[PDB]
PDB file of C-alpha atoms and ligand atoms in Angstrom:
ATOM      1  CA  UNK A   1     -16.278 -21.585   3.764  1.00  0.00           C
ATOM      2  CA  UNK A   2     -19.914 -20.182   4.387  1.00  0.00           C
ATOM      3  CA  UNK A   3     -18.440 -17.642   6.797  1.00  0.00           C
ATOM      4  CA  UNK A   4     -16.615 -15.871   3.859  1.00  0.00           C
ATOM      5  CA  UNK A   5     -19.927 -15.709   1.787  1.00  0.00           C
ATOM      6  CA  UNK A   6     -21.423 -13.823   4.729  1.00  0.00           C
ATOM      7  CA  UNK A   7     -18.688 -11.183   4.538  1.00  0.00           C
ATOM      8  CA  UNK A   8     -18.964 -10.470   0.943  1.00  0.00           C
ATOM      9  CA  UNK A   9     -22.835 -10.231   1.280  1.00  0.00           C
ATOM     10  CA  UNK A  10     -22.384  -7.844   4.079  1.00  0.00           C
ATOM     11  CA  UNK A  11     -19.556  -5.741   2.697  1.00  0.00           C
ATOM     12  CA  UNK A  12     -21.404  -5.672  -0.676  1.00  0.00           C
ATOM     13  CA  UNK A  13     -24.497  -4.426   0.878  1.00  0.00           C
ATOM     14  CA  UNK A  14     -22.508  -1.930   2.704  1.00  0.00           C
ATOM     15  CA  UNK A  15     -20.884  -0.622  -0.133  1.00  0.00           C
ATOM     16  CA  UNK A  16     -24.436  -0.275  -2.040  1.00  0.00           C
ATOM     17  CA  UNK A  17     -26.211   1.363   1.137  1.00  0.00           C
ATOM     18  CA  UNK A  18     -23.555   3.796   1.076  1.00  0.00           C
ATOM     19  CA  UNK A  19     -24.810   4.885  -2.655  1.00  0.00           C
ATOM     20  CA  UNK A  20     -28.498   5.345  -1.566  1.00  0.00           C
ATOM     21  CA  UNK A  21     -29.080   1.737  -3.169  1.00  0.00           C
ATOM     22  CA  UNK A  22     -30.141  -1.224  -0.962  1.00  0.00           C
ATOM     23  CA  UNK A  23     -29.877  -5.183  -0.865  1.00  0.00           C
ATOM     24  CA  UNK A  24     -29.763  -8.081   1.389  1.00  0.00           C
ATOM     25  CA  UNK A  25     -27.876  -6.771   4.273  1.00  0.00           C
ATOM     26  CA  UNK A  26     -26.025  -8.763   6.656  1.00  0.00           C
ATOM     27  CA  UNK A  27     -24.830  -6.577   9.457  1.00  0.00           C
ATOM     28  CA  UNK A  28     -26.230  -9.087  12.099  1.00  0.00           C
ATOM     29  CA  UNK A  29     -27.477 -12.285  10.610  1.00  0.00           C
ATOM     30  CA  UNK A  30     -24.732 -14.772  11.047  1.00  0.00           C
ATOM     31  CA  UNK A  31     -21.697 -14.171  13.206  1.00  0.00           C
ATOM     32  CA  UNK A  32     -18.189 -12.748  12.997  1.00  0.00           C
ATOM     33  CA  UNK A  33     -19.732  -9.203  13.650  1.00  0.00           C
ATOM     34  CA  UNK A  34     -16.424  -8.061  14.865  1.00  0.00           C
ATOM     35  CA  UNK A  35     -14.753  -8.864  11.382  1.00  0.00           C
ATOM     36  CA  UNK A  36     -17.780  -7.370   9.230  1.00  0.00           C
ATOM     37  CA  UNK A  37     -17.161  -4.058  11.036  1.00  0.00           C
ATOM     38  CA  UNK A  38     -13.226  -4.179  10.869  1.00  0.00           C
ATOM     39  CA  UNK A  39     -13.611  -4.918   7.223  1.00  0.00           C
ATOM     40  CA  UNK A  40     -16.182  -2.279   6.373  1.00  0.00           C
ATOM     41  CA  UNK A  41     -13.992   0.499   7.995  1.00  0.00           C
ATOM     42  CA  UNK A  42     -10.808  -1.058   6.220  1.00  0.00           C
ATOM     43  CA  UNK A  43     -12.553  -0.701   3.086  1.00  0.00           C
ATOM     44  CA  UNK A  44     -13.522   3.056   3.656  1.00  0.00           C
ATOM     45  CA  UNK A  45      -9.940   4.107   3.999  1.00  0.00           C
ATOM     46  CA  UNK A  46      -8.860   2.048   1.301  1.00  0.00           C
ATOM     47  CA  UNK A  47     -10.461   3.961  -1.314  1.00  0.00           C
ATOM     48  CA  UNK A  48      -9.869   7.317   0.656  1.00  0.00           C
ATOM     49  CA  UNK A  49      -6.031   6.795   0.788  1.00  0.00           C
ATOM     50  CA  UNK A  50      -3.701   5.945  -2.178  1.00  0.00           C
ATOM     51  CA  UNK A  51      -3.826   8.648  -4.817  1.00  0.00           C
ATOM     52  CA  UNK A  52      -3.524   6.808  -8.142  1.00  0.00           C
ATOM     53  CA  UNK A  53      -4.500   2.897  -8.582  1.00  0.00           C
ATOM     54  CA  UNK A  54      -8.016   2.634  -8.036  1.00  0.00           C
ATOM     55  CA  UNK A  55     -10.161   4.989  -9.960  1.00  0.00           C
ATOM     56  CA  UNK A  56      -8.564   3.517 -13.091  1.00  0.00           C
ATOM     57  CA  UNK A  57      -8.129  -0.057 -11.885  1.00  0.00           C
ATOM     58  CA  UNK A  58     -12.096  -0.319 -11.542  1.00  0.00           C
ATOM     59  CA  UNK A  59     -12.464   0.647 -15.130  1.00  0.00           C
ATOM     60  CA  UNK A  60     -10.131  -2.268 -16.100  1.00  0.00           C
ATOM     61  CA  UNK A  61     -12.862  -4.594 -16.011  1.00  0.00           C
ATOM     62  CA  UNK A  62     -16.260  -3.778 -16.477  1.00  0.00           C
ATOM     63  CA  UNK A  63     -18.575  -6.786 -15.594  1.00  0.00           C
ATOM     64  CA  UNK A  64     -21.448  -7.360 -17.896  1.00  0.00           C
ATOM     65  CA  UNK A  65     -24.064 -10.068 -18.713  1.00  0.00           C
ATOM     66  CA  UNK A  66     -21.731 -11.552 -21.233  1.00  0.00           C
ATOM     67  CA  UNK A  67     -18.465 -11.108 -19.011  1.00  0.00           C
ATOM     68  CA  UNK A  68     -17.059 -14.549 -17.665  1.00  0.00           C
ATOM     69  CA  UNK A  69     -15.661 -15.845 -14.380  1.00  0.00           C
ATOM     70  CA  UNK A  70     -12.340 -16.135 -15.795  1.00  0.00           C
ATOM     71  CA  UNK A  71     -12.266 -12.358 -16.882  1.00  0.00           C
ATOM     72  CA  UNK A  72     -12.930 -11.385 -13.428  1.00  0.00           C
ATOM     73  CA  UNK A  73     -10.271 -13.782 -11.906  1.00  0.00           C
ATOM     74  CA  UNK A  74      -7.592 -12.227 -14.137  1.00  0.00           C
ATOM     75  CA  UNK A  75      -8.223  -8.942 -12.514  1.00  0.00           C
ATOM     76  CA  UNK A  76      -7.823 -10.449  -8.937  1.00  0.00           C
ATOM     77  CA  UNK A  77      -4.714 -12.197  -9.899  1.00  0.00           C
ATOM     78  CA  UNK A  78      -3.097  -9.223 -10.857  1.00  0.00           C
ATOM     79  CA  UNK A  79      -3.974  -7.660  -7.269  1.00  0.00           C
ATOM     80  CA  UNK A  80      -2.331 -10.808  -5.648  1.00  0.00           C
ATOM     81  CA  UNK A  81       0.484 -11.304  -7.974  1.00  0.00           C
ATOM     82  CA  UNK A  82       3.292 -10.193  -5.665  1.00  0.00           C
ATOM     83  CA  UNK A  83       1.978 -12.357  -2.611  1.00  0.00           C
ATOM     84  CA  UNK A  84      -0.958 -11.840  -0.318  1.00  0.00           C
ATOM     85  CA  UNK A  85      -1.520  -9.871   2.816  1.00  0.00           C
ATOM     86  CA  UNK A  86      -4.290  -8.294   4.861  1.00  0.00           C
ATOM     87  CA  UNK A  87      -3.506  -5.140   3.141  1.00  0.00           C
ATOM     88  CA  UNK A  88      -4.237  -6.317  -0.631  1.00  0.00           C
ATOM     89  CA  UNK A  89      -6.969  -8.700   1.083  1.00  0.00           C
ATOM     90  CA  UNK A  90      -9.078  -5.621   1.529  1.00  0.00           C
ATOM     91  CA  UNK A  91      -8.611  -4.585  -1.995  1.00  0.00           C
ATOM     92  CA  UNK A  92     -10.313  -7.652  -3.292  1.00  0.00           C
ATOM     93  CA  UNK A  93     -13.651  -6.552  -1.685  1.00  0.00           C
ATOM     94  CA  UNK A  94     -13.185  -2.870  -2.421  1.00  0.00           C
ATOM     95  CA  UNK A  95     -12.962  -3.986  -6.080  1.00  0.00           C
ATOM     96  CA  UNK A  96     -16.056  -6.438  -6.020  1.00  0.00           C
ATOM     97  CA  UNK A  97     -18.251  -3.342  -4.380  1.00  0.00           C
ATOM     98  CA  UNK A  98     -17.397  -1.043  -6.960  1.00  0.00           C
ATOM     99  CA  UNK A  99     -18.417  -3.385  -9.631  1.00  0.00           C
ATOM    100  CA  UNK A 100     -21.754  -4.071  -8.066  1.00  0.00           C
ATOM    101  CA  UNK A 101     -22.283  -0.099  -7.710  1.00  0.00           C
ATOM    102  CA  UNK A 102     -21.523   0.146 -11.591  1.00  0.00           C
ATOM    103  CA  UNK A 103     -24.162  -2.616 -12.500  1.00  0.00           C
ATOM    104  CA  UNK A 104     -26.782  -0.852 -10.479  1.00  0.00           C
ATOM    105  CA  UNK A 105     -26.007   2.468 -12.199  1.00  0.00           C
ATOM    106  CA  UNK A 106     -26.849   0.713 -15.442  1.00  0.00           C
ATOM    107  CA  UNK A 107     -29.908  -0.837 -14.149  1.00  0.00           C
ATOM    108  CA  UNK A 108     -28.364  -4.235 -13.725  1.00  0.00           C
ATOM    109  CA  UNK A 109     -28.860  -5.151  -9.947  1.00  0.00           C
ATOM    110  CA  UNK A 110     -29.261  -8.873 -11.071  1.00  0.00           C
ATOM    111  CA  UNK A 111     -25.550  -8.786 -11.733  1.00  0.00           C
ATOM    112  CA  UNK A 112     -24.807  -7.897  -7.984  1.00  0.00           C
ATOM    113  CA  UNK A 113     -25.811 -11.557  -7.306  1.00  0.00           C
ATOM    114  CA  UNK A 114     -23.275 -12.630  -9.842  1.00  0.00           C
ATOM    115  CA  UNK A 115     -20.286 -10.787  -8.457  1.00  0.00           C
ATOM    116  CA  UNK A 116     -20.971 -12.137  -4.909  1.00  0.00           C
ATOM    117  CA  UNK A 117     -20.747 -15.645  -6.042  1.00  0.00           C
ATOM    118  CA  UNK A 118     -17.696 -14.915  -8.136  1.00  0.00           C
ATOM    119  CA  UNK A 119     -15.994 -13.376  -5.179  1.00  0.00           C
ATOM    120  CA  UNK A 120     -16.880 -16.399  -2.719  1.00  0.00           C
ATOM    121  CA  UNK A 121     -15.439 -18.757  -4.988  1.00  0.00           C
ATOM    122  CA  UNK A 122     -12.079 -16.959  -5.402  1.00  0.00           C
ATOM    123  CA  UNK A 123     -12.236 -16.354  -1.582  1.00  0.00           C
ATOM    124  CA  UNK A 124     -12.192 -20.270  -0.990  1.00  0.00           C
ATOM    125  CA  UNK A 125      -9.865 -20.951  -3.697  1.00  0.00           C
ATOM    126  CA  UNK A 126      -6.920 -18.312  -3.496  1.00  0.00           C
ATOM    127  CA  UNK A 127      -6.976 -16.239  -0.322  1.00  0.00           C
ATOM    128  CA  UNK A 128      -8.849 -18.981   1.890  1.00  0.00           C
ATOM    129  CA  UNK A 129      -5.616 -21.027   2.107  1.00  0.00           C
ATOM    130  CA  UNK A 130      -3.611 -17.851   2.968  1.00  0.00           C
ATOM    131  CA  UNK A 131      -6.204 -16.653   5.418  1.00  0.00           C
ATOM    132  CA  UNK A 132      -5.782 -20.109   7.162  1.00  0.00           C
ATOM    133  CA  UNK A 133      -2.052 -19.822   7.364  1.00  0.00           C
ATOM    134  CA  UNK A 134      -2.183 -16.122   8.987  1.00  0.00           C
ATOM    135  CA  UNK A 135      -3.874 -16.312  12.036  1.00  0.00           C
ATOM    136  CA  UNK A 136      -7.245 -16.400  10.293  1.00  0.00           C
ATOM    137  CA  UNK A 137      -9.424 -13.601  10.015  1.00  0.00           C
ATOM    138  CA  UNK A 138      -9.583 -13.120  13.841  1.00  0.00           C
ATOM    139  CA  UNK A 139      -5.717 -11.568  13.401  1.00  0.00           C
ATOM    140  CA  UNK A 140      -7.303  -9.184  10.790  1.00  0.00           C
ATOM    141  CA  UNK A 141      -9.368  -7.473  13.642  1.00  0.00           C
ATOM    142  CA  UNK A 142      -6.849  -7.662  16.195  1.00  0.00           C
ATOM    143  CA  UNK A 143      -4.407  -5.757  13.919  1.00  0.00           C
ATOM    144  CA  UNK A 144      -6.586  -3.742  11.881  1.00  0.00           C
ATOM    145  CA  UNK A 145     -10.251  -3.241  13.494  1.00  0.00           C
TER     146      UNK A 145
HETATM  147  C1  LIW B 201      -3.998   0.930   9.354  1.00  0.00           C
HETATM  148  C2  LIW B 201      -4.990   1.232   8.374  1.00  0.00           C
HETATM  149  C3  LIW B 201      -6.430   1.079   8.711  1.00  0.00           C
HETATM  150  C4  LIW B 201      -4.550   2.230   7.005  1.00  0.00           C
HETATM  151  S1  LIW B 201      -5.383   2.252   5.531  1.00  0.00           S
HETATM  152  C5  LIW B 201      -5.258   1.049   4.312  1.00  0.00           C
HETATM  153  C6  LIW B 201      -4.122   1.160   3.429  1.00  0.00           C
HETATM  154  C7  LIW B 201      -3.886   0.208   2.305  1.00  0.00           C
HETATM  155  C8  LIW B 201      -4.618  -1.074   2.586  1.00  0.00           C
HETATM  156  C9  LIW B 201      -5.689  -1.204   3.307  1.00  0.00           C
HETATM  157  C10 LIW B 201      -5.994  -0.282   4.407  1.00  0.00           C
HETATM  158  N1  LIW B 201      -4.726  -0.097   7.496  1.00  0.00           N
HETATM  159  C11 LIW B 201      -3.790  -0.934   7.077  1.00  0.00           C
HETATM  160  C12 LIW B 201      -2.468  -0.131   6.805  1.00  0.00           C
HETATM  161  C13 LIW B 201      -1.582  -0.883   6.019  1.00  0.00           C
HETATM  162  C14 LIW B 201      -1.573  -2.053   5.477  1.00  0.00           C
HETATM  163  S2  LIW B 201      -0.272  -3.067   4.891  1.00  0.00           S
HETATM  164  O1  LIW B 201      -0.488  -4.538   5.034  1.00  0.00           O
HETATM  165  O2  LIW B 201       1.173  -2.310   4.931  1.00  0.00           O
HETATM  166  N2  LIW B 201      -0.600  -2.809   3.155  1.00  0.00           N
HETATM  167  C15 LIW B 201      -0.627  -1.768   2.444  1.00  0.00           C
HETATM  168  O3  LIW B 201      -0.026  -0.900   3.162  1.00  0.00           O
HETATM  169  C16 LIW B 201      -0.854  -1.736   0.872  1.00  0.00           C
HETATM  170  C17 LIW B 201      -1.526  -2.922   0.345  1.00  0.00           C
HETATM  171  C18 LIW B 201      -1.622  -3.121  -0.913  1.00  0.00           C
HETATM  172  C19 LIW B 201      -1.727  -1.761  -1.749  1.00  0.00           C
HETATM  173  N3  LIW B 201      -2.159  -1.816  -3.423  1.00  0.00           N
HETATM  174  C20 LIW B 201      -3.168  -2.814  -3.793  1.00  0.00           C
HETATM  175  C21 LIW B 201      -3.124  -3.320  -5.042  1.00  0.00           C
HETATM  176  N4  LIW B 201      -2.344  -2.398  -6.239  1.00  0.00           N
HETATM  177  C22 LIW B 201      -3.199  -1.452  -7.232  1.00  0.00           C
HETATM  178  C23 LIW B 201      -4.621  -1.336  -6.480  1.00  0.00           C
HETATM  179  C24 LIW B 201      -4.446  -0.248  -5.513  1.00  0.00           C
HETATM  180  C25 LIW B 201      -5.724   0.221  -4.707  1.00  0.00           C
HETATM  181  C26 LIW B 201      -6.754  -0.324  -5.118  1.00  0.00           C
HETATM  182  C27 LIW B 201      -7.003  -1.450  -5.869  1.00  0.00           C
HETATM  183  C28 LIW B 201      -5.736  -1.972  -6.607  1.00  0.00           C
HETATM  184  C29 LIW B 201      -5.877  -3.093  -7.692  1.00  0.00           C
HETATM  185  C30 LIW B 201      -6.806  -2.963  -8.502  1.00  0.00           C
HETATM  186  C31 LIW B 201      -7.472  -4.173  -9.388  1.00  0.00           C
HETATM  187  C32 LIW B 201      -6.456  -5.280  -9.472  1.00  0.00           C
HETATM  188  C33 LIW B 201      -5.425  -5.330  -8.695  1.00  0.00           C
HETATM  189  C34 LIW B 201      -4.902  -4.085  -7.513  1.00  0.00           C
HETATM  190  C35 LIW B 201      -1.385  -1.335  -5.600  1.00  0.00           C
HETATM  191  C36 LIW B 201      -1.664  -1.033  -4.323  1.00  0.00           C
HETATM  192  C37 LIW B 201      -1.268  -0.583  -0.940  1.00  0.00           C
HETATM  193  C38 LIW B 201      -0.757  -0.546  -0.033  1.00  0.00           C
HETATM  194  C39 LIW B 201      -2.982  -2.792   5.720  1.00  0.00           C
HETATM  195  C40 LIW B 201      -4.080  -1.991   6.386  1.00  0.00           C
HETATM  196  N5  LIW B 201      -5.395  -2.865   6.351  1.00  0.00           N
HETATM  197  O4  LIW B 201      -6.361  -2.294   6.918  1.00  0.00           O
HETATM  198  O5  LIW B 201      -5.472  -4.062   5.789  1.00  0.00           O
END
């Protein structure tokens, strides 16, 4: 669903903007303004909390011009290996943002667009099914937002 794609572009932009960088922002364009906000906030606390499992994980996969989508999907699978939930859902995004920020550091913003697509796909072929069977996103905001 295009809706999801909007969240990715928005979340990614917010993550990049936090490090000074910039990109095609999405905090107002489409709809689901509440979802975007609730997500951004949820992402912040994500990194903050949790001592281990975060700084090392990001290193597990180093997105590269040669890297394939299959290599990125494997990292995501591990995240949702013991089921799926709003808690882990945020991880998916927080993980993508980190990759984008890294690509920029190595003068590879072009990769950013790629990560965005890779996320949109997995989002509509793994979590999408679950999200629909959990009160959609509206619930994520009602509980966490
Ligand atoms: C109230 C508050 C606002 C507090 S902050 C918060 C805490 C946890 C999750 C979200 C928000 N939100 C809040 C509280 C509790 C909840 S909750 O549904 O009970 N969910 C959790 O507590 C929770 C979910 C997943 C977790 N890991 C992710 C993947 N693994 C490696 C791991 C750990 C960390 C990062 C990446 C990875 C990872 C990387 C690469 C591949 C796979 C996994 C191990 C650890 C740890 C805790 C959700 C939310 N939520 O917003 O969705």
